[PDB]
Amino acid sequence: RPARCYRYQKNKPYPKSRFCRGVPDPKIRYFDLGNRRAKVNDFPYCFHLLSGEKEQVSSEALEACRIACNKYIAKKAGKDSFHLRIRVHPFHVIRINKMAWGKPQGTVARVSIGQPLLSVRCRASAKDYVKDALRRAKFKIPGRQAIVESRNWGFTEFTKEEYEDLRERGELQYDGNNAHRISRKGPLN
Amino acid sequence: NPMRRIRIEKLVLNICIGEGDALTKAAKVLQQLTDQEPTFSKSRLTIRGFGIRRGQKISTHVTVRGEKAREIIERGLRVKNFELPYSCFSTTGNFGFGITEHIDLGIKYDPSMGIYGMDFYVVLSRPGFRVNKRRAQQQHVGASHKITPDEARAWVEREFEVVY
Amino acid sequence: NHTSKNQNRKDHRNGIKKPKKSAYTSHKGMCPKYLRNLRRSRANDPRQSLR
Amino acid sequence: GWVKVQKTRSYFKRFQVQFRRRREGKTDYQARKALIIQDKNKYATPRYRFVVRRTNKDIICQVTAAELTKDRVVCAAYSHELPRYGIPVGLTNYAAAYATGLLCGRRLLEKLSVGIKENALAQLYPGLDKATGEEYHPDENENEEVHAFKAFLDIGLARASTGARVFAAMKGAVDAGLNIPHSMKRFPGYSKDGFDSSALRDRIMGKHVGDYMAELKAEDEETYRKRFSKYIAAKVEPLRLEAMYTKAHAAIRANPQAVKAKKPVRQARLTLKERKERIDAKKLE
Amino acid sequence: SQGYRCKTRYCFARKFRRHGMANLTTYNRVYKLGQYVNIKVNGAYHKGMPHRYYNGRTGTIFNIGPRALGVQIQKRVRGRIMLKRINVRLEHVHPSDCRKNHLERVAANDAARRLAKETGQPVPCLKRQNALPRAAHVVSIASAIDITPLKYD
RNA sequence: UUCGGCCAUCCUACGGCGGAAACUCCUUAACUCGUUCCGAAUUAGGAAGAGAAGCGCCGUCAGGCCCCGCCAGUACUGCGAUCGGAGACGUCGUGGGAACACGGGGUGCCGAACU
RNA sequence: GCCUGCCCCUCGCCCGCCCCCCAAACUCCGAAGGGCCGCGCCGCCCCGCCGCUGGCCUGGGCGGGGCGGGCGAAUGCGGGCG
RNA sequence: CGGAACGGCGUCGGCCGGUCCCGACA
RNA sequence: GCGGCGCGCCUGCUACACCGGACCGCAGGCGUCCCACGGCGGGCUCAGCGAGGACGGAGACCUCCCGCGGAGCAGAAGGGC
């Protein structure tokens, strides 16, 4: 059945629960891709694919968009130079009245306008190729999606300038692939 | 402080037989050793492997307190050769050992009875341990007052000269 | 199978009528003991319309 | 090894503290509600509870009206005050409890009477003068016009058992004319269809301790000196305990009115700046 | 289905950390006939429970009875307001304020008239006023701050 | 201290500090009563000990809980629009206005009786 | 590394701290919006009645005087009942 | 000229960076 | 027509925060069971972690600890304790 049909919101969030027994598994199963175990300082530049429309992206689109992005930046640089995060998860079940209540078939992620849909954490070498891979993803997803570069360091919430001052003092605490402040609360010991 | 001196609150001997003739005859052995009538404990579940059906009395126990506790604990510890593992001390301060047979206590074996082990558990207390037992103003015992596993080994080595 | 369109219009055409004044001071559902005493007190006072 | 923390931030966030006096362990709110409950048609007229509380060294009987934000104690008699009346020792025993209760009944009826100071009150309900335990119910034997002051026993977390000291005080205020509802089944001397009025008066007079004191002296004088040290020092002879309490019962009746007979350092709590420095001292390490 | 406690999951449910028995003021509050009471159901107490409709409904006491109060509530059915007389146990009834502003105002209204009899002859207007226009003021614009719409991010 | 009111600014965890009185722990089973067994509880009878606890205080970059900010005129939304847009969405009036985070600061108080 | 070993190296495993995203049948919170009710005949002093209430001389109801008063948001507008 | 994702070196208007009298090898 | 049965009733939802609101709209029940599984008073603490105890192991049973109820309350669900 076409995404020219289930694109719009016509059913209230329908999760996979005791109310949705025997649900079809999503086509997208891998949401963290690339070097997921890479450290925060390794990848300073971050990029995003946003949504220009509030719609429902299917798991087929989210998965086709994922194969497209990875293959390109990994053939252009390496599978060790970027971290690709699918920032939308297909948690809404879509119904079809097979031949009046529809049987459970397919899963749609109800994206919002102005919502991250795909993020890349990249090193200096792949800054040139990331906006290209995200462009390839745009064709796979429905709507007027729109690329952007985040003026923040990494997947962290610190701005590139903000990261420098905290890192220089040591206030910035290294927390795996992300980073948080040292905290002035809790037992001193 | 004389109010920080450890003592034996109680000794609970369990004979988990798992047969009714056997269960009752183990009640007699507990009865002779402690002089107080034991109570029976019922099965909480049915397990076919252990040959147990729910609602059936599976074990007998007597809570022996006082000098009678000290006497039975000493007789039992002697069966162990006054040797008690270092692990058997609990984080709460209590410790326990298990004996096999009853003749090793010294209760004569009679063909009228059977042969059965006792699981001796000893609970240690300090004056002031009734604050978490009183109906009125039940309050938890302060952490300092509470007996520590190491400070319990210290008390038991001094008392029955047991070695870990 | 069901509609409430025009029900409210009909209700307020000459409506939202107050519930009289008799109902407010009625003795239905009052305690029998209070009522018996109220009858005894008014009956034995000079206010009572006894023969 | 690595275990879950049962007391997480969540446990604390969802925890509902019990009522302070339940958390303290001092009050049961099931009993309290039922004692305090009056029919709404009785309005604000006070319902009075005869609260009897027993400490390690004292028995306090208190008559307590319940108000909206407070409890008003109309009259209280403490067993600490009974050597004024000639009981110099055993101030928590069964006989003391009966007399502390007798003090409560006489004191309350007299405080109410000094309000009439004229026709009928504490005199209309004189109370049993001798202390035979003989099923006295002052509430409905006679009454009419003025009625016996009514209070309901609040035993508290005390266990109501045959021979409990809580009942002793109740028989005591019932013997000073306070009407307290009873059945004479939890007071010594009751079996099936009969009540022996001697066994109740034996405990109310001290016979149980007298027999023990004499038996301890004869069997083992060493224990008698250790167990009954204060009684021996106060020169209380066992076969004279009944008269001592009998004259205390008379004395409490004659003069119920009660005579009206420091600060720890509490180191001052630090102001915020002092703590703001104390952390800095710990921080500088 | 429309049983007595249908659609009551969130209204007859205790408040987050207000579960359990109730303050004993509920059973020691003295109510008088003609008093305004607010009906707020308690989930823990089941005997004497008003229907969901009654929750949030103010009413007057018509009967003070043993154990329960009788409350007259004006329920609108269709084009008619009907007086409904419900007997509620003490757990679900709360002394209503409702007339707390009036009872205070009527008293303070007496105060100016008492002061007229005493010193302070002029009487203040005791009619309530609805705001009225702001009136004339002089404002110092010396520390004026020039605010400006700004660029988009 | 006993009884309460409202029921965490009162709870939880650990660390101190304190008791003349009070409270407690405590100390005994002749009696009473009491323990699926056990004076553990509980009932009774005490006074030889004790602050070790409970309790009263004080802590603790404590957790929680409370309060004021900020978040943020944000998110949402009542009313009007021959407003935009192909739509699903969004503006423009003209009125309402959260929340999580985050920052600071707090950590029970009352009313009777008695001492 | 070794007859083998827990002598161990890594994973699954538990436990903590983070993080991406959620819920019509989840809620610590919580709007807009709506609902119910109030917005006048107040005090003060006595006096009467009651098989009702109660330790009382207490209440509580219903009356009856007298006394210090007084009509207490806006805007519109005569309302009720067969 | 109902209309979409996407194209336009059609034409006007913007936003943000790079070089250019160190002429945008002579 | 077949097929069902939102033909009488009940719970959470859709349902739009008073009330009210629909569909052969969504996930389920009911037609019974019980002289105790009822009333009432007492006493008690629950499921469990964590540590500890002859046979005993993953699960037999006996102890302490902290246990906001994470158990139970006949049978649906949601409240309640």
In Å, how far is C50's CA from the nearest CA of chain D? 28
Strands B118-125 and B95-99: antiparallel
How close, in Å, is residue D283 to chain A by CA atoms?
7
Distance of CA D43 to the CA centre of its chain: 28
Burial grade of B101 (CB within 10 A; 0-12, 13-18, 19 or more): middle
Residue pair A33/A137 in contact (Cβ under 8 Å)? The answer is: no
For chains B and D, having 3+ Cβ pairs within 8 Å is answered yes
B143 CA, I67 C1': Å apart: 17
Q: A138: which nucleotide lies closest, measuring CA to C1'?
A: H5
Q: Which residue of D has its CA nearest to E24?
A: D33
Q: Which residue has the tokens 């992005």?
A: A69
Q: Is D59 exposed, middle or buried (0-12, 13-18, 19+ CB in 10 A)?
A: buried
Three-state SS for A165?
Answer: helix
- Residue E144's alpha-carbon distances to C8, C43, E135, E149, in angstroms, are 54, 80, 22, 16
Phi and psi at D92, nearest 5°, equal -120, 15
CA–CA distance, D157 with D25 (Å, rounded to integer): 9
Rounded Cα gap, residues D243 and D228, in angstroms: 19
* Residue from the list D16, D32, D40 with its beta carbon closest to the beta carbon of E24: D32
Query: E67, D39 in Cβ contact below 8 A?
Result: yes
Instruction: Select from E65, E56, E114 the least CA-distant residue to E88.
Output: E65
Report chain B's C-alpha Rg in angstroms: 17
Residues in chain C: 51
> Nearest nucleotide (C1') to the CA of residue A139?
H5
Q: Is D268 on the interface with A (CB under 8 A)?
A: no
| DSSP count for chain B of H helices, then E strands | 3, 5
Under a CB-based contact definition with an 8 Å cutoff, are residues D89 and D234 in contact? yes
**B32 CB-side CA count, 13 A:** 14
Q: Is A187 on the interface with D (CB under 8 A)?
A: no
Q: Which two tokens stand for residue A126?
A: 């792949």
Q: Is the CB of B128 under 7 A from strand I?
A: no
How far is the C-alpha of D204 from the C-alpha of B129, rounded, in Å? 34
Would you tell me which residues 40-69 of chain D have a C-beta closer than 8 angstroms to some C-beta of chain C?
A: 41
Is C40 touching D (CB cutoff 8 A)?
no
Cα distances (Å, whole numbers) of residue A157 to A44, A46, A150, A154, D31: 12, 11, 10, 8, 58
Q: Judge whether A35 and A91 are in contact, CB under 8 Å.
A: no
CB D165 within 8 A of CB D97: yes
B137 touches chain D (CB under 8 A): yes
* The dihedral sign for the CA sequence C10, C13, C19, C20: negative
D271 part of contact set with chain C, CB < 8 Å: no
Q: How far apart are CA E68 and CA E82, in angstroms?
A: 22
Q: Does C31 touch chain D (CB under 8 A)?
A: yes
Q: For E24, which of D15, D33, D44 is closest by C-beta distance? A: D33
| Resolution to one decimal, Å | 3.4
Which residues of E fall within a CB distance of 8 Å from C10?
A: 79
For residue B115 the two structure tokens come to 């042969």
Q: Are B75 and B106 in contact (CB under 8 A)?
A: yes
Smallest CA–C1' distance to F57, residue: D266
Residue with tokens 């003749």: B103
D279 neighbourhood in chain A, CB within 8 Å: 188
Protein chain E, residues 92-131, with a C-beta closer than 7 Å to any atom of nucleic acid strand I: none
How many interface pairs between D and E have CB atoms less than 8 angstroms apart?
43
Structure tokens given for D284: 């500088």
Rounded Cα–Cα distance for residues E151 and A128 (Å): 29
Q: For D55, name the nearest residue in chain B, comparing CA atoms only.
A: B136
* Residue whose C-alpha is closest to residue A62's, from A121, A145, A128: A145
Q: What is the largest CA-CA distance in chain C?
A: 64
Q: Does any CB of chain E come closer than 8 Å to the CB of residue C13?
A: yes
User: Can you tell me the distance from the alpha carbon of B55 to that of A138, in angstroms, rounded to the nearest whole number?
Assistant: 68
Q: Which residues of C touch E64 (CB under 8 A)?
A: 31, 34
Distance of A42 CA from F60 C1′ (whole Å):
39
Nearest alpha-carbon partner for D162 in D141, D186, D145: D186
**What positions of strand H are covered by protein, i.e. any atom < 7 Å from a CB?**
5-6
Residue E87: its chain C contacts at CB < 8 A?
A: 29
Distance from CA of C33 to the nearest CA of E (A): 9
Residue B90: C-alpha distances to residues B93, B152, D1, E73 (Å): 5, 9, 15, 64
In angstroms, the separation between the Cα of residue D67 and the nearest Cα of chain E is 8
D40 and E69 within 8 Å at the Cβ level: the answer is yes
Question: Contact, E61 vs E71, CB < 8 A?
Answer: yes
Burial of A115 (0-12, 13-18, 19+ CB in 10 A): middle
> Is there contact between B49 and strand I, defined as CB under 7 Å from any strand atom?
yes
Q: Kindly list the residues from chain D whose CB atom is less than 8 angstroms away from the CB atom of residue C31.
A: 41
What's the gap between Cα A186 and its chain centre?
A: 33
Answer for the pair A65, A27: CB distance below 8 angstroms, yes or no: no
> Could you tell me if A90 and A59 are in contact, meaning their C-beta atoms sit under 8 angstroms apart?
yes
Are C13 and E79 in contact (CB < 8 Å)?
yes
Tell me how many helices (H) and strands (E) chain C has: 2, 0
Q: Tell me which residue has tokens 């999760």.
A: A15
| Two structure tokens written together for B85 | 């593992």
The DSSP line for chain D is -----SS-HHHHHH--PPPHHHHHTS--HHHHHHHH---GGGTT---EEEEEEE-SS-EEEEEEEE-SSSEEEEEEEEGGGGGGGT--S-TTSHHHHHHHHHHHHHHHHHHHHHHH-SSSSTTTS---SS-------HHHHS--SS---BEEEE-TTS---TT-HHHHHHHHHHTTT-B----SSSSTTEETTEE-TTHHHHHHHTHHHHHHHHHHHHH-HHHHHHHTHHHHHTT--GGGHHHHHHHHHHHHHH--PPP-------PPPPPHHHHHHHHHHHHH-
Q: Chains contacting E with at least 3 CB pairs below 8 Å?
A: C, D
DSSP-derived secondary structure letter, B52: B
Residue of D nearest to C31 (CA): D41
Determine what percent of chain C falls in helix, strand and coil, rounding each to the nearest 5: 40, 0, 55
SS (H, E, C) D52-114: EEECCCCEEEEEEEECCCCEEEEEEEEHHHHHHHCCCCCCCCHHHHHHHHHHHHHHHHHHHHH
DSSP output for B7-25: EEEEEEEEEE---HHHHHH
Minimal C-alpha gap between C36 and chain D (Å): 14
Q: Give all strands of the β-sheet with B118-125 in edge-to-edge order.
A: B39-42, B57-64, B7-16, B118-125, B95-99
Report the 10 Å Cβ neighbour count for D103: 31
**Alpha carbons D204 and D214: distance in angstroms, whole number:** 18
CA–CA separation, B78 vs B58, rounded Å? Answer: 28
- Does C34 contact D at CB distance below 8 Å? yes
In sequence order, the 6+-apart residues with CB closer than 8 A to the CB of A108 are A6, A56, A57, A58, A59, A90, A92, A93, A94
**D16/E17 touch (CB, cutoff 8 Å), yes or no:** yes
Tokens at residue D49, please?
A: 């509870």
Chains D and E, touching by 3 or more CB pairs within 8 angstroms: yes
What contacts A181, CB < 8 A, 6 or more positions away?
Answer: A166, A171, A172, A173
The answer to whether D75 and D237 are in contact (CB under 8 A) is no
Which residue is listed with tokens 């003068």?
A: D129
DSSP conformational letter for E66: S
One DSSP character per residue, A21-57 reads -SPPPPS----EEESTT--TTT--EEEEEE-SS-EEE
Contact C15 E80 (CB under 8 A): yes
Half-sphere exposure of B104 (CA within 13 A, CB side): 16
CB contact under 8 A, E79 and C34: no
Query: D106 vs chain C: nearest CA distance in angstroms?
Result: 36
Is C15 marked as binding a ligand? yes
Which of D25, D156, D159 shows the shortest C-beta gap to B138? D25
Chain D residues closer than 8 Å to E28 by CB: 36, 66-68
Q: Which residues contact D3 (CB under 8 A, 6 or more apart)?
A: none
Nucleotide nearest to D139 (CA to C1'): G55
Query: Do A155 and A116 meet the contact criterion of CB atoms below 8 Å apart?
Result: no
Q: How does strand D151-154 pair with strand D48-54?
A: parallel
Identify the residues numbered 36 to 65 in chain E whose C-beta atom is closer than 7 Å to any atom of strand I.
43-44, 46, 52-53, 55-56
D199 CB neighbour count, 10 Å cutoff? 17
Distance CA D108, CA D64 (A): 11
Q: How far is B38 from chain D (nearest CA, A)?
A: 26
Can you name the residues that pair with D63 across neighbouring β-strands?
Answer: D50, D75
Name the 3-class secondary structure at A104. Answer: strand
Q: Please report the residues numbered 11 through 50 in chain D whose beta carbons come closer than 8 angstroms to any beta carbon of chain B.
A: 24-26
Q: What is the DSSP letter of B89?
A: B
Q: Using CA atoms, how far apart are residues D94 and D229, in angstroms rounded to an integer?
A: 19
With CA atoms as reference, report the closest residue to D170 among D243, D94, D242: D94
Amino acid letter at B147? I
User: Taking CB atoms and an 8 Å cutoff, what residues of chain B touch D159?
Assistant: 135
Q: Is the dihedral of CA A97, A99, A100, A103 positive or negative?
A: negative
> In which residue are the tokens 């006894």 written?
C50
CA gap B152, B93 in Å, rounded? 5
Q: Is E26 helix (H, G, I), strand (E, B) or coil?
A: helix
B12, two tokens: 């609970």
CB–CB of A92/A108 below 8 Å?
Answer: yes
